[PDB]
């Protein structure tokens, strides 16, 4: 069924790096508006990143300059590299395909927890 | 950066009655909105977007309203499974950017 | 008209006054790169290209050399080394209706980034699977032309700004648009220095 499955979630020592990956099925990603969302335990949600269909990507300000989205078009999947995870970045990360005025984000991913040593 | 505040925080209503949920904006959000029901354990689900347009499939039992800085979601007859968290998402600035609310906890009996 | 398939005009063979340009009262923002306003008033060129259109107020920051966003990446994209200036007016009265002055449909679905000055007016259905919405419904039936819904309750950031961009070309220039200095009556019957057209 239409779905988004995620990977890369785990635990890493501060200052370290990590890479989140997002796989899809029965639907393409290369030609689909992609949006990565995340959630800290107990709080709301926040738009983290987006990659377009021409390549011009964008990131939120809170994570600007540190995270980089990429996607293996050949096998219909999305990726988000993270580094220097600090005390804030402990959160569950979601993958989303946002359309906007013609249907807001609908198909989402099971999520993936990303915590730090402390 | 429009800050959204939901209300009330919690709600426990007997089965079979109506439910009224308010979502309050801090600036002009006209009719750019959406409502997500994030049943505990997985990603949210869109119920009603824009001002009151019902997302596909979404039972007609839901109704959204409001404009400007104040919006409201209303449920006709709460069933036992309606207990979940709900969020009002605005998108008056689509070009990658979004701002969520504080969420509302709804329960039954 | 719209930012979707904007309107253009090629000025040539005239004396570019400029006395009103950037000097009329209700102008909101004017800024040029490469040329100073006064130098512009004394600069001279072969031809001019004016490209007027209407965009949403919160998107005016995207009209800039190589600037990236939505209107400047999929709708209308100006080069990176574009020398010249743009002007934008808050048409929060001239083009707006409580019913929605959305006659214009901006571009929200494009297959690939824009080349500088690439008119990409098209009527298609951006999609994911086999067919477009003519034979499919719900999934992959998207249409890039989205209305604006300009109405007065909208805040400034969402009021249709009318914008006009000037591009002076200088290749092989038998310049036909110039004339900042043309006056002073000639003194007669006295030994005088004269400067007649050079």
């Amino acid at each position: 069924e239409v779905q988004l499955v995620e990977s890369g979630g785990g635990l890493v020592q501060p200052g370290g790096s990590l890479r989140l990956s997002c796989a899809a099925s029965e639907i393409t990603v290369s030609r689909n508006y992609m949006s990565w969302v995340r959630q800290a335990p107990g709080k709301g949600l926040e738009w983290v990143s987006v990659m377009f269909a021409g390549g011009s990507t964008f990131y939120a300000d809170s994570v600007k300059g540190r995270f980089t989205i990429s996607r293996d078009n050949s096998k219909n999947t999305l990726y988000l590299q993270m580094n220097s995870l600090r005390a804030e970045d402990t959160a569950v990360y979601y993958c989303a395909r946002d359309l906007g005025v013609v249907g807001a984000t609908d198909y989402w991913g099971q999520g993936t927890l990303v915590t730090v040593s402390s | 950066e429009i800050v959204m505040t939901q209300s009330p925080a919690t709600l426990s209503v007997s089965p079979g009655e109506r439910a009224t949920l308010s979502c309050r904006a801090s600036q002009s959000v006209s009719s750019d909105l959406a409502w997500y029901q994030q049943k505990p354990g997985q990603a949210p689900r869109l119920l009603i977007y824009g001002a009151s347009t019902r997302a596909t499939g979404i039972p007609a039992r839901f109704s959204g309203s409001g404009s400007g800085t104040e919006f409201t979601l209303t449920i006709s007859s709460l069933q036992s499974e309606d207990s979940a968290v709900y969020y009002c998402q605005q998108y008056n600035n689509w070009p990658p950017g979004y701002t969520f609310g504080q969420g509302t906890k709804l329960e039954i009996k | 008209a719209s930012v979707y398939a904007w309107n253009r005009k090629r000025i040539s063979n005239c004396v570019a006054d400029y006395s009103v340009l950037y000097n009329f009262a209700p102008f909101f923002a004017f800024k040029c790169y490469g040329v100073s306003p006064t130098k512009l008033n004394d600069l001279c060129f072969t031809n001019v290209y004016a490209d007027s259109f209407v965009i949403r107020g919160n998107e005016v920051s995207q009209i800039a050399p190589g600037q990236t966003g939505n209107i400047a990446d999929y709708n209308y994209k100006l080069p990176d080394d574009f020398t010249g200036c743009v002007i934008a007016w808050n048409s929060n009265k001239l083009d707006s209706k409580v019913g929605g002055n959305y006659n214009y449909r901006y571009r929200l679905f494009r297959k690939s980034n824009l080349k500088p000055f690439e008119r990409d007016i098209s009527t298609e259905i951006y999609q994911a699977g086999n067919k477009p919405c003519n034979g499919v419904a719900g999934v992959n039936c998207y249409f890039p032309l989205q209305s604006y819904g300009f109405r007065p309750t909208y805040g400034v950031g969402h009021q249709p700004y009318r914008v006009v961009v000037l591009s002076f070309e200088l290749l092989h220039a038998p310049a036909t648009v110039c004339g900042p200095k043309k006056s002073t009556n000639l003194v007669k019957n006295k030994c005088v220095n004269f400067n007649f057209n050079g």
Side-chain angles (χ1 to χ4, degrees), chain A residues 17-30 32-70 72 74-75:
Chain A
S17 162
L18 183 140
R19 179 185 191 197
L20 303 166
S21 313
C22 176
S25 81
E26 180 206 330
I27 310 288
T28 79
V29 175
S30 311
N32 287 34
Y33 272 135
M34 293 333 283
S35 271
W36 283 70
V37 186
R38 84 192 197 182
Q39 173 171 0
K43 69 99 157 178
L45 280 293
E46 61 167 2
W47 175 96
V48 189
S49 174
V50 60
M51 170 173 184
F52 282 3
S56 279
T57 173
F58 306 88
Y59 309 86
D61 59 355
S62 45
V63 309
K64 185 65 56 160
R66 327 203 294 103
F67 299 169
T68 176
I69 183 159
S70 307
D72 277 27
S74 277
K75 186 257 296 173

Side-chain angles (χ1 to χ4, degrees), chain B residues 40-104:
Chain B
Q42 77 291 339
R45 176 177 71 140
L46 161 71
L47 293 176
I48 289 176
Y49 53 112
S52 84
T53 170
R54 283 199 330 274
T56 85
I58 295 325
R61 75 190 286 285
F62 303 92
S63 199
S65 314
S67 171
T69 76
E70 313 262 9
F71 305 82
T72 80
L73 175 58
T74 185
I75 290 90
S76 72
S77 85
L78 215 94
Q79 175 65 308
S80 177
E81 301 280 299
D82 285 276
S83 315
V85 66
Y86 299 74
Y87 300 72
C88 50
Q89 182 211 70
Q90 64 180 20
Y91 59 110
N92 49 357
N93 319 321
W94 186 81
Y98 280 145
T99 300
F100 295 96
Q102 201 65 358
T104 52

Side-chain angles (χ1 to χ4, degrees), chain A residues 78-94:
Chain A
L78 188 61
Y79 302 102
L80 199 150
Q81 200 284 332
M82 288 195 311
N83 45 38
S84 279
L85 314 308
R86 54 205 181 207
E88 64 94 5
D89 275 330
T90 77
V92 58
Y93 289 63
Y94 286 99

Side-chain angles (χ1 to χ4, degrees), chain B residues 28 30-32 92-95, chain C residues 58 62 70 108 154-155 158:
Chain B
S28 199
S30 45
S31 169
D32 288 346
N92 49 357
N93 319 321
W94 186 81
Chain C
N58 59 1
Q62 291 167 9
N70 179 302
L108 177 63
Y154 276 44
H158 276 52

Side-chain angles (χ1 to χ4, degrees), chain C residues 74-79 82-91 93-94 96 99-100 102-103 106-110 112-114 116-117 120 122-131:
Chain C
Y74 295 150
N75 197 300
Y76 168 54
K77 192 189 256 184
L78 68 160
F82 156 68
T83 188
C85 54
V86 306
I87 60 162
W89 317 348
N90 173 31
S91 69
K93 279 75 66 179
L94 186 141
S96 194
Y102 51 79
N103 45 288
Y106 78 115
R107 191 57 83 89
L108 177 63
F109 283 91
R110 159 74 150 166
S112 67
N113 215 326
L114 265 178
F117 308 129
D120 59 342
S122 38
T123 315
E124 81 292 336
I125 290 303
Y126 198 86
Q127 53 85 358
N130 192 277
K131 201 65 189 103

Side-chain angles (χ1 to χ4, degrees), chain C residues 8-21 23-55 57-58 60-72 74-79 82-87:
Chain C
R8 191 170 202 163
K9 183 50 60 195
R10 31 188 292 194
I11 318 290
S12 200
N13 301 21
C14 162
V15 286
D17 188 21
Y18 296 133
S19 75
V20 308
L21 294 300
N23 291 49
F24 188 31
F27 296 158
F28 178 76
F30 80 91
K31 159 195 63 152
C32 4
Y33 298 115
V35 174
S36 97
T38 170
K39 293 196 298 204
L40 184 45
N41 309 129
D42 88 345
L43 294 175
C44 197
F45 296 108
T46 203
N47 206 290
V48 186
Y49 292 125
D51 297 71
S52 65
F53 49 111
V54 168
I55 60 181
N58 59 1
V60 295
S61 87
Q62 291 167 9
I63 301 298
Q67 191 90 357
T68 300
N70 179 302
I71 290 61
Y74 295 150
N75 197 300
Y76 168 54
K77 192 189 256 184
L78 68 160
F82 156 68
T83 188
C85 54
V86 306
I87 60 162

